[PDB]
Structure formats: structure tokens, C-alpha cells
Amino acid sequence: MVRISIAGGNEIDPGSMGLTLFHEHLRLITEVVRWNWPHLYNEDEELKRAIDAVNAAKKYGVKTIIDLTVAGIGCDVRFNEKVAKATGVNIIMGTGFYTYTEIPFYFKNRGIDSLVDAFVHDITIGIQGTNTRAAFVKAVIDSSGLTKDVEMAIRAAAKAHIKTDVPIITHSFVGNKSSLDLIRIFKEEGVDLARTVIGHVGDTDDISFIEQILREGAFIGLDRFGLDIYLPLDKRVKTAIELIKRGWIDQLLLSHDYCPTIDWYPPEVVRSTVPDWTMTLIFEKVIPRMRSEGITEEQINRVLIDNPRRLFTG
Amino acid sequence: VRISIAGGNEIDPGSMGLTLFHEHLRLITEVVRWNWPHLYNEDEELKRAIDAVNAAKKYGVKTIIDLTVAGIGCDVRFNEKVAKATGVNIIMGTGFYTYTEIPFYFKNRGIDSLVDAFVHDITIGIQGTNTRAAFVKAVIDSSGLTKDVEMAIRAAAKAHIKTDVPIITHSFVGNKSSLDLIRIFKEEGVDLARTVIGHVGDTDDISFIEQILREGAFIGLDRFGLDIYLPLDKRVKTAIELIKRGWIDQLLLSHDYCPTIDWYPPEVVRSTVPDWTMTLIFEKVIPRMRSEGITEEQINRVLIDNPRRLFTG
Ligand SMILES: CCCCCCCC(=O)CC(=O)N[C@H]1CCOC1=O
Numbered sequence A: 001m002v003r004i005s006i007a008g009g010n011e012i013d014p015g016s017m018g019l020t021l022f023h024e025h026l027r028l029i030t031e032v033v034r035w036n037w038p039h040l041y042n043e044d045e046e047l048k049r050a051i052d053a054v055n056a057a058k059k060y061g062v063k064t065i066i067d068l069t070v071a072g073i074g075c076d077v078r079f080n081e082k083v084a085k086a087t088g089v090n091i092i093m094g095t096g097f098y099t100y101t102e103i104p105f106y107f108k109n110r111g112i113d114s115l116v117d118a119f120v121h122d123i124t125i126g127i128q129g130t131n132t133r134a135a136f137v138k139a140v141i142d143s144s145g146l147t148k149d150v151e152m153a154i155r156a157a158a159k160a161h162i163k164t165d166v167p168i169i170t171h172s173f174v175g176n177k178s179s180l181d182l183i184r185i186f187k188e189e190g191v192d193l194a195r196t197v198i199g200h201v202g203d204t205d206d207i208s209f210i211e212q213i214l215r216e217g218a219f220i221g222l223d224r225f226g227l228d229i230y231l232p233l234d235k236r237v238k239t240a241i242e243l244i245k246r247g248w249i250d251q252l253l254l255s256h257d258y259c260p261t262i263d264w265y266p267p268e269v270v271r272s273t274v275p276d277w278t279m280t281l282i283f284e285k286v287i288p289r290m291r292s293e294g295i296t297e298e299q300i301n302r303v304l305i306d307n308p309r310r311l312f313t314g
Numbered sequence B: 001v002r003i004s005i006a007g008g009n010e011i012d013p014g015s016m017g018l019t020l021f022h023e024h025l026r027l028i029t030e031v032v033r034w035n036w037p038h039l040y041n042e043d044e045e046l047k048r049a050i051d052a053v054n055a056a057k058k059y060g061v062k063t064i065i066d067l068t069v070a071g072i073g074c075d076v077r078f079n080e081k082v083a084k085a086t087g088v089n090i091i092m093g094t095g096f097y098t099y100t101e102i103p104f105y106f107k108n109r110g111i112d113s114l115v116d117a118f119v120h121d122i123t124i125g126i127q128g129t130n131t132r133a134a135f136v137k138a139v140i141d142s143s144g145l146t147k148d149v150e151m152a153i154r155a156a157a158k159a160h161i162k163t164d165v166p167i168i169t170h171s172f173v174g175n176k177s178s179l180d181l182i183r184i185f186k187e188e189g190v191d192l193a194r195t196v197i198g199h200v201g202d203t204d205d206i207s208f209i210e211q212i213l214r215e216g217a218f219i220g221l222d223r224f225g226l227d228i229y230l231p232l233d234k235r236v237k238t239a240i241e242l243i244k245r246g247w248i249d250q251l252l253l254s255h256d257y258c259p260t261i262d263w264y265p266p267e268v269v270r271s272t273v274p275d276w277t278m279t280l281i282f283e284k285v286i287p288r289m290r291s292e293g294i295t296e297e298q299i300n301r302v303l304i305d306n307p308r309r310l311f312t313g
């Protein structure tokens, strides 16, 4: 009975998601740069890179990818439709506003409701003039902390969840404990935390801090496998195995946050700095290592199939 | 000098004629337009832009310099439609409009990547077209000189040094940020005669204004009709006084008019600055200045020769 729009305006139910990567990207670009300086980009090559990435995940049994690209990081339904068509993978899209500091004057001068309404439109009508609806909302906080504008956008994500019941999938930054501001704001807004992911929690191996989040009842995103600059692979794998052994499995989500294009850094820089980052590292290295430490096949399926499904059905 | 105008034709500075040096055709926020097109109507935007430029045209305006750059919604194709419907020359530029931050794309690559982007626009073309940028914009406002704002100002200066296009600025007089533009341009070796210090008309403080003028730059008395920044009568008195005090060759007049501005609902704009248009200088400013002894030829020096000299030096 829950219906999830997917890139192309089809719908699936949560039961047919199957093996899912809950936080990945197809193309991460900056709208104001791309609009004004198209010569710095190449759409054919972006498309090839996203297709190649998704096909690689698909060879390992991925059926569904949740694209966490929203406004501010270059969301494009038409791009995603080409990717979906070429690959046959389900692509789930969302809404929200991605920022660490400021929001546009457009919404600041109109008030929080204007931002909620834009999100609700994407969820109930469709994204960017299409019939693909947003099936989740994103809230973002980072190293600048809880600025007024960031607070507004997090609260607008919350209010949009209260009106539509779509899950809230977040970005946080663990070094300043911003993860906890998400939870506090969500509690104030009456959000059921079981319908939320506190993101980028896998960027720390501090288990007591992770449990402080877990005891509030939310999902956590162990979601940057392959980005050693946030936390090395060995510590991420160790953390995930330990959290399963301690009884936290129903709250764990795994992903790579992989960006087949990311315009924030030259591609040479990304290759030099995180050469292991792909959309398949979980299947190549993480799962084999977890299996060798006693994690079961069914535990892996609970994480990669049942948890993403339950985020969408409750 | 050859000046590209929207459409990729080129004009020489002599053919600019009566020029509005700081206006807009459409001021919108790229990230919002890209993500929520349902909040916009392109036919209506076009119509408002055309109507505004045709009103100006009625008063003899031949050329409008569109100060819309990256950050506030610049679109060559939109402008080409306006140019073609109206017959008015539209001159475009490049730069990055921000009061605080610049994109990660540029911050992680460094200053040269932003310079090169501007230079691309000036020497090859804007947005895949053959309309080249004819000026570069630099911006500072009430947040002051942040690190990113400083970078973008210095990048505009460096692009000016490579290409010799003029620099038309935005500043905020309330914190004296106008003076940071000046200091930075001097450090970069810019001839200030090739620059406009923008939004100076937002104050009637003669001493502050003369501090800028003695540096040799043009000043933008460029928001006629925005009473919320400064009432029309103070703007008019200030312009008359500056002419009388000998500064005519450094004065530029405009309205900063936005036929669309997505920062505010249209009803709030109508309600707050109902006299804001792209023709108020012709309807009210010029008749008041003439009644105070300002001559016809003085008016032409400000509205014809000054914009020309900005492009020729
Ligand atoms: C030198 C920097 C090396 C490149 C590392 C890549 C950094 C990232 O791309 C992290 C990242 O993805 N942050 C953004 C993009 C996905 O959504 C986010 O929150």
C-alpha cells in the first residue's frame, strides 16, 4: 500500500526495493556554477560515469539506489531517468535543501512555510515539472553547526515529514556533535525518530557517541565506506561488526555516498585522495570481512534489504 | 573597442548612445529556479522585461547594461529574446555575486579557476554562446570583507588586468565596504578610472562620497526609485550638488530596476517601492535637475559620455 515513486514516474512498493544502497549519488554538481559556466562540464561523460557506477553495483545484486542529491548539490530528474533507463536499477529521489550555512533570500524573505511548501510539492505533485515524486526529505548540518538558516531548513524538513509521512534521511558532521541537534529539533517537531536516518555516523569509531544516537531510536548511516579521509576502512568495518554484535542491527544502514561526478574537487584530486571510493566497495571488501568475523548472510540481508524497506514502510 | 551585445552582434562605444549603465532584465536565484520551476513563469518574466525595456526605449534609451551575473540568474538566451523583441542593445558581463561565500568548486581550486572562468566569458563567450562579457562585476555588502568575498573581488580585478574590460561593482555604504573595493583594486594595480564603485547613491553623505571620488573612480548613483535605500529627493539633491562641486565626469545614473526579482514576493515589492521603474530618471530626476540649473549638455555628459568612457577609458 505504500507507493514509492522512482526515477521515471513509475512506482514500486517497499517490498520490491530488494537489495538497496540507501545513500549514493549519480551526479553531484553545483547549480550556480553549471548554470553560468557549462564549459566546465561534460554531460556525456557524467552520464557514462553514473551508468558505469550503477551497472557495477547492479552486478553485485543491487536492485535499488536512493539518490541523496537534492537542491544545492545539483538534483536533476531528467538526468536520473537516463541513468535508470540505461541500467534498469530503481532510482529513488528526494527533496530538501542542502546547505551548511545559508539558505536563499528567496525562502528567508518568505518564511519557513515557503520552504515546507516547496518540499511538499515535490513529495505530492512531482519534482522539476515531472511525475517523479520525492519519496524522502533531506536535512543537513555540518561543521558550521546550527546556524539560523540551517535550523530553518531542518525544521522545514521535519514539518514536511509530519505532513506527508516520507522518511527523513540526513547529513550530519560528527566532529561537533551536530548529529544531536538533528535529534533535538526532530523531537521538538514531533517526529518519530524511527522514521529518520542520522547520517554520516560511520565517520567515527567512537562507539559510546554512536550509542547515544542509537538509544534515541533512529537509524544511523554507516554511509561513507571508501572515504578514508573521514574514517579509514578498517575502523568502519570494525565499527559495523561491533554494533551488530552488540544487538543494534535493526538500526544500521550501509552505503558508500559515492559520487560518479562531484564538482567540488578536480577529479585528479579525488583519485589521489580516496582511490578506493566506488559504488561497490561494500560488496568487494566490507561484506567478506564481516562474514569472516562471524556476521551471517541473514544479518547482511537484514541490513541491506530489510532496514531500507522499513525506513519507507515503518 | 568592440562590445558584444546580447545576440553576439558587436557595437563600438560610440554607438551606445543614451545608456542605462545598471539595470536588470530578470534577477532570479539559480538554485531555486533549477529545483522548483513551479515557482516561476517564464512567459510572464519575459513580458515584464520587454515592457520595462520598451518603456526606457520611449525615452530614448539605446543601450542597457544588464548587471545580472552568476548568483543572480544571468541567462544569455533570455536576454537575446528581450533584445530581439525591443531593438535595445543589451550589454552583459561576468563575475560572481555573493555577499559571503563562494562555491566549493572555486574555493577548492583557488583564485585562478574563478579568474579563468571570467576570462572565458570575456574572451570566448557566455554560456556556450558568442555573446562575450564586456565588463566584470565585483560585490561586497553588509557582511564586509569575508575571505570568499575578498577572493571574488580580487578575481574580478585580475580578470580586468588580463582583458581591460571595465569593473562595475556592488557595494553597501552603511559599513564603508565601498572603500575595501578601492583598497583591493589598488593592491591589484587596477586603474580606478576603469571602475565604478556601486550603490554610492544610497547615501547623501558628501564627505564619504568625496573620499571615493578623489580616488578617481566613477560612482554609481544607481538606485533611483529605491526609497528604502534613500529617498528620491535626497538622491536628486546629492546628484545636483556633486555636479556643482565639479564631479560630473565621475557620475553614473541608473535605477537598478528588476522587472523580476525572486528575492521577494512581487506584491511586497509593489507595496514597498511602488515608484521603482526603469524610467523614473526621465520622468522625475532629469526634470528636477534641469529646474535647478543643470544643463542639457550636462545631462548628456552623464548619460551618454560617461558610460561610453567607461568602455573606452
Ligand atoms: C580532497 C578531497 C577528496 C575528495 C573526497 C570526496 C569528498 C566527498 O565527496 C564527501 C561528500 O560526498 N560530501 C557531500 C557530497 C555527498 O553528499 C555530501 O554530503
Ligand SMILES: CCCCCCCC(=O)CC(=O)N[C@H]1CCOC1=O
Residues within 6 Å of the ligand: B024, B027, B170, B226, B228, B256, B258, B261, B263, B264, B268, B269, B272, B273
Ligand atoms: C522589502 C522589499 C524590498 C523591495 C525592493 C528590493 C529591491 C532590491 O533588491 C534592490 C536590488 O535589486 N538589489 C540587488 C539586486 C539588483 O542588484 C542587487 O544587488
Ligand SMILES: [Co+2]
Residues within 6 Å of the ligand: A170, A171, A172, A199, A200
Ligand atoms: Co552528506
Ligand SMILES: [Co+2]
Residues within 6 Å of the ligand: A023, A024, A025, A068, A257
Ligand atoms: Co551524500
Ligand SMILES: [Co+2]
Residues within 6 Å of the ligand: B169, B170, B171, B198, B199
Ligand atoms: Co547591486
Ligand SMILES: [Co+2]
Residues within 6 Å of the ligand: B022, B023, B024, B067, B256
Ligand atoms: Co543591480
